[PDB]
From a paper:
Since in the previous structure of the 7S complex the N-terminal tail (N-tail, residues 22–31 visible) of Gemin2 is located inside the central RNA-binding pocket, it is possible that this N-tail induces the narrowness of the 5Sm. To test this possibility, we reconstituted Complex C, a derivative of Complex A with Gemin2ΔN39 replacing Gemin2, for crystallization. The crystal of Complex C had the same space group as Complexes A and B and similar unit cell parameters to them. However, the curvature of 5Sm is still the same as that of the previous complex (Data not shown). The absence of Gemin2′s N-tail did not change the curvature of D1/D2/F/E. These data demonstrate that Gemin2′s N-tail does not play a role in the narrowness of 5Sm and the narrowness of 5Sm is caused by the rest part (residues 40–280) of Gemin2. Superposition of 7SΔN with U4 Sm core or U1 Sm core (Data not shown) on SmF/E/G reveals that there is no clash of Gemin2′s N-terminal domain (NTD) with RNA, and on SmD1/D2 reveals that there is no clash of Gemin2′s CTD with RNA too. This indicates that Gemin2ΔN39 and RNA are not spatially exclusive. However, the binding of Gemin2ΔN39 on the periphery of 5Sm inhibits RNA assembly into the central RNA-binding pocket of 5Sm, allowing only the cognate snRNP code containing RNAs preferably to assemble into the Sm subcore.
The assembly of snRNP cores, in which seven Sm proteins, D1/D2/F/E/G/D3/B, form a ring around the nonameric Sm site of snRNAs, is the early step of spliceosome formation and essential to eukaryotes. Gemin2 is the acceptor of 5Sm. SMN binds Gemin2 by its N-terminal Gemin2-binding domain (Ge2BD, residues 26–62). By binding the outside of the horseshoe-shaped 5Sm and constraining it in a narrow conformation, Gemin2 helps 5Sm select RNA substrates, allowing preferably the cognate snRNAs, containing the snRNP code, to assemble into the inside of 5Sm to form subcores; the assembly of cognate RNAs widens 5Sm, which in turn causes Gemin2′s release and allows SmD3/B to join to complete the assembly of Sm cores.
Author numbering:
A (entry chain A): 1 to 81
B (entry chain G): 10 to 49, 52 to 72
C (entry chain 2): 42 to 73, 79 to 127, 133 to 151, 173 to 280
D (entry chain M): 35 to 52
E (entry chain B): 15 to 77, 88 to 117
F (entry chain E): 14 to 90
G (entry chain F): 3 to 76
The structure:
């Protein structure tokens, strides 16, 4: 229960998330809960056969996520503590 | 949770549904069904069987 | 004790004791060939003296973004102002943007009408053409343009597509023998946006 | 500036000095 | 302090595979449920195989079938998405 | 009302032959005689068989351990 | 004479095993190691998708939740 402690330090970081359906979701993290459920704002959703979608906010279930792409600038060694 | 010994029809994940009469239930929400039959395509019986809390999308009478 | 158990709780409890009785983690020492997973190439480092300085590469990105900031700001106006081939008519597109008539530059009144899937499609077509023909400034413009019209976050396939494009640019860079070669500025630029701007920094030309 | 892209491009290509 | 055992359990036992990568700066190859493969270095991980990765190549083929890939500087991978993990994978251009 | 565990337990006492309905997989069932389990409902399963669907075919596995998370449903046979 | 899952599992270590996943791929190899949650480590691993050997992976780790069943082999 210590990798998920790290996600929660990522407010105000903008990321891209692969969903399990393969949708790429770019936005800024407002909050991550302890089961990996993620609330975003300033959201842009890339879909297989459909133009993009802007959204003021979106929240996503932890178990619909494939992974997070993190900003390259992100300082990992710091946050891994 | 008042349904007991009252015939039930069930929908399990993976698109499969079954009908039987409840005889029991556990905290985990996993329950025992009697004289059940699995309704394809015509269907058939499986007597008494156990079912997981999950794997049960919907349940109706 | 020695009598079987009679209720699961007892069985479950009986098992648990047994479990603790077992070492949690084991490691079998054993006594004494594997498939290969092919991985696409990186970019080809630039011939010495042809690699651009970071500051240039950074300055360009920063500039590129502005361009996309405006292109997106005025998409709708241009949207409504030259029969634009079907989405899946590669040849038609190829002829269209490039010619053998002569080609249809990539104006904001033409690209702006272009939906995401199509943009992606065209790049492909143009890439395919590229592999099998010489880079021309007309290409650069088109490629640059469409790149301008790609909207993040990019689909994975799009990512791969632009990567193959970069790799080809680097490959063509090798053939060049004078800095005065026209291609060089363009090829570097292309390998800068997709490397810096589109986040594929494994392909970037980190100099020296 | 219905050709502000074509322009931008040239501008970039010409922005290369080395 | 008992938690200490956890790490001894990581040095051996099947998670060693990952702690290898963290300890030695080695690359692993993960088969993913996206039906793609990830080749990268493990910066950190937990008992669920949630992972922080560095320098990841996402590799897949498609179509006759062409190889495709894409690169990812830094990544948080949910363990759920993991199928198998190769220690010392073998890769070639 | 008999909480299921009693029914699983019963299957263990009789050493009944059972069929398992897999969570992730609908084209296939597992069949075997149950000789042990635990609170995760993991089952050691003797003389076991993959039964496939449509194809009316049965594959001998022998003694296997079946993970508990995979189980949608248990019946007798 | 009830055989229970952990003991049985520890029993398989050091021997060829065939492991089948909840998604239908399966792996054959030597069970080098195992742990509390039943993750497993395999050596000289093989690949058999839809019954077809697909690859030789050498040393591999398998997340537990993936496993459908594991069985011994000779």
């Amino acid at each position: 229960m210590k990798l998920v402690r790290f996600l929660m330090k990522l407010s105000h970081e903008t990321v891209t998330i692969e969903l399990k359906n393969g949708t790429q979701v770019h936005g800024t993290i407002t909050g991550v809960d302890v089961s990996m459920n993620t609330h975003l704002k300033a959201v842009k959703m890339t879909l297989k056969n459909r133009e993009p979608v802007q959204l003021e906010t979106l929240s996503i279930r932890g178990n619909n996520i494939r992974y997070f792409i993190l900003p390259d600038s992100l300082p990992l060694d710091t946050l891994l503590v | 949770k008042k349904f007991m010994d009252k015939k039930l029809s069930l929908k399990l994940n993976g698109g499969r549904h079954v009908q039987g009469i409840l005889r029991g239930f556990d905290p985990f929400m996993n329950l025992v069904i009697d004289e059940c039959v699995e309704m394809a395509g015509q269907q058939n019986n499986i007597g008494m069987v156990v079912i997981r809390g999950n794997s049960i999308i919907m349940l109706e009478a | 004790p020695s009598v079987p158990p009679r209720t699961p709780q007892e069985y479950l409890r009986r098992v648990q004791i047994e479990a603790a009785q077992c070492p949690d983690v084991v490691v079998a020492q054993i006594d004494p060939k594997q498939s290969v997973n092919i991985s696409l190439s990186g970019c080809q480092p630039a011939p010495e003296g042809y690699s651009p300085t970071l500051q240039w590469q950074q300055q360009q990105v920063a500039q590129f973004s502005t361009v996309r900031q405006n292109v997106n700001k005025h998409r709708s106006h241009w949207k409504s102002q030259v029969t634009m081939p079907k989405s899946e008519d590669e040849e038609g597109w190829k002829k269209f943007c490039l010619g053998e008539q002569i080609g249809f530059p990539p104006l904001l009144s033409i690209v702006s009408r272009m939906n995401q899937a199509t943009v992606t499609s065209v790049l492909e077509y143009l890439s395919n053409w590229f592999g099998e023909r010489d880079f021309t400034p007309e290409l650069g413009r088109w490629l640059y343009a469409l790149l301008a019209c790609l909207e993040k976050p990019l689909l994975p396939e799009a990512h791969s597509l632009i990567r193959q494009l970069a790799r080809r640019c680097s490959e063509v860079r090798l053939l060049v023998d004078s800095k005065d070669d026209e291609r060089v500025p363009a090829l570097n630029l292309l390998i800068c946006l997709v490397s810096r701007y589109f986040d594929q920094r494994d392909l970037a030309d980190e100099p020296s | 500036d219905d050709t502000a892209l074509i322009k931008a491009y040239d501008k970039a290509v010409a922005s290369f000095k080395h | 302090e008992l938690q200490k055992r956890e790490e001894e359990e990581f040095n051996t036992g099947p998670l060693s595979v990952l702690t290898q990568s963290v300890k030695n700066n080695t690359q692993v190859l993960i088969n993913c449920r996206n039906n793609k493969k990830l080749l990268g270095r493990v910066k950190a991980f937990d008992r669920h195989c949630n992972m922080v990765l560095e320098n990841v190549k996402e590799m897949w083929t498609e179509v006759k079938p062409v190889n495709k890939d894409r690169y990812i500087s830094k990544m948080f991978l949910r363990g759920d998405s993991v199928i198998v993990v190769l220690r010392n994978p073998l890769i070639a251009g | 009302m008999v909480q299921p565990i009693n029914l699983i337990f019963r299957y263990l006492q009789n050493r009944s032959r059972i069929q398992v309905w897999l969570y992730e997989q609908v084209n296939m069932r597992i069949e075997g005689c149950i000789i042990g389990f635990d609170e995760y409902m993991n089952l050691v399963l003797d003389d076991a068989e993959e039964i496939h669907s449509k194809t009316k075919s049965r594959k001998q596995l022998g003694r296997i351990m079946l993970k508990g998370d995979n189980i949608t449903l248990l019946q007798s046979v | 004479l009830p055989l229970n899952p952990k003991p049985f599992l520890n029993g398989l270590t050091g021997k060829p095993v065939m492991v089948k996943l909840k998604w239908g791929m399966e792996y054959k190899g030597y069970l080098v190691s195992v742990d509390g949650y039943m993750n497993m480590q395999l050596a000289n691993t093989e690949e058999y998708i839809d019954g077809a050997l697909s690859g030789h992976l050498g040393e591999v780790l398998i997340r537990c939740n993936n496993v459908l069943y594991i069985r011994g082999v000779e």
